[model samples]
Target: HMLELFDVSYEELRLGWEVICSQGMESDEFDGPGTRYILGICEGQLVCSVRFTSLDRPNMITHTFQHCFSDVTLPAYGTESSRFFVDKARARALLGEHYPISQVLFLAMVNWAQNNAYGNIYTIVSRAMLKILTRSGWQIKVIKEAFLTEKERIYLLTLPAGQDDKQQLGGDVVSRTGCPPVAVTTWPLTLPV
Candidate 1:
């Protein structure tokens, strides 16, 4: 019911979006009673989706995958709220389901979250999402087991964001020319490199 009324329009987020590589994870991006707008194309048609209304846009609280209790007035997790799925054929047609989609969505959400000065993302995952988790450098841990389906396993992946210090000032060029002379106005490093 709440998802139907998110305040922002799809055009707003689509317009505000800037493409960039993303770091960090947000599992609880939709928590609380706020508004969010989403735009995606399907079957050559544009689709608009909204979640939450009234414009609070609070930081979502991380919850265990199986936790059934809702203690606070903050947003509650909806089963279909933050998930996307496709069969093998469709998955392959989509350039492997999770990767491209996750990369795109994560980057978009990260941009939105950072601009709002909010931190932290709460997410729950199924076995199928393992590949994406591993690719994203998330730390996955077993949280539960499925006795009904002996092969079933449930896990949680915690991903944190940070800079990669190894990045050279000029990348491959740095290995060839060494770091360019540091300008006093730009750098005053005293540490040995």
Candidate 2:
């Protein structure tokens, strides 16, 4: 049900796009360079997909793509369980089953950044994702807290390897969905993304 650097037909891509869009945790904005396509197939049927944006060194940029809708609960201030992720196991098995996929994914991504020329690859994790990242050595660098609206607050996470202080401002990492906008924004807060 999982494949690395997976490519499929346009019909499949569009179908996967529908699943992602319907899930409400991903988006339709996929226009950029260094973007790698990944798709998850369950029983020969495409169930989930994601795209990663990578930039070469000198420029040293890594922007992640995969759009998501907003989480609306932040306005009413509901806590926990707000999103759906069809490929949860994809991350859980990133670096072998021994390590959390978040760490593994980040590690692989860091390697990707290095291979592509970036000294470091920046990662964004929200309050929900932090519960897992914190246990794995992902220290918070630039924590931007604010009420994007009365019901919503946004936080930014960065990987620190020396260039974060300067590049943090230049980075465009933010809430892709800008939470309190999803129908189940509180789910991942309780369940893993």
Candidate 3:
């Protein structure tokens, strides 16, 4: 009953994925292992959603960032952290409802990471996102500094797994869920890599 009240829909997410990925923040490369999504719901509507996949798998981070910065090397397997996104329209919709959707979703990701023992999570974001994360009270370090594009600059931000760090940046909890907020619908999707 409660779930129906919220507008969380996989179809909506799929549509958002197609539109958002086209912006170049992420690639359209689907079909991979460990692909996961975290969605924020308000009054039963999905106002925010973010995707995560295993870094150990064939993913955007490993193929794009790993090769983009050929000078740096990351673990080969079981790294399990990279690739994330938050639908913009949904974010605005949720924000209008007086929810800090990104912060809430981020805190949830932190909890997920802790539970899964991801240790540290890596992501590439635009320069604007870097500033947004910093201003949002997240402690992130830039791994690769010399990378850029026309509209956005690529950056490698490390979310270190420290007790104090997580607590400080965890932000506020809007509500608690008895079950995992993330839902995995598909598995072993053929990688077009």
Q: Whose lDDT is greatest here?
A: 3
Report each candidate's C-alpha RMSD, comma-separated, in the order given: 12.9, 14.7, 8.7
Ranked by lDDT, the better of candidates 1 and 3 is 3
The reply for model 1, stretches above 4 Å from the true place, is 1-37, 41-81, 85-99, 137-150, 161-193
* Separate clash counts for every candidate: 7, 22, 8
- Per-residue lDDT over 72-135 for candidate 3, one digit per residue giving the tens place of the 0 to 100 score: 5666543333334455675555444433455555565565566566667777777777888777
- Please, what is the whole-model Cα lDDT of each candidate in the order they appear? 0.31, 0.34, 0.51
The per-residue C-alpha lDDT of model 3 at residue 112 equals 57
In order of lDDT, best first, we have: 3, 2, 1
Question: Which parts of model 2 have CA positions greater than 4 angstroms off?
Answer: 1-27, 37-51, 54-86, 89-99, 161-193
Tens-digit lDDT string for candidate 1 (87-130): 23432343333323333333333333333333423334557666
Error of 3 at 27 (Å): 8.1
**Model 3: CA > 4 A from native:** 1-27, 77-84, 87-98, 171-193
Model 1 residue 34 CA deviation (Å) reads 1.9
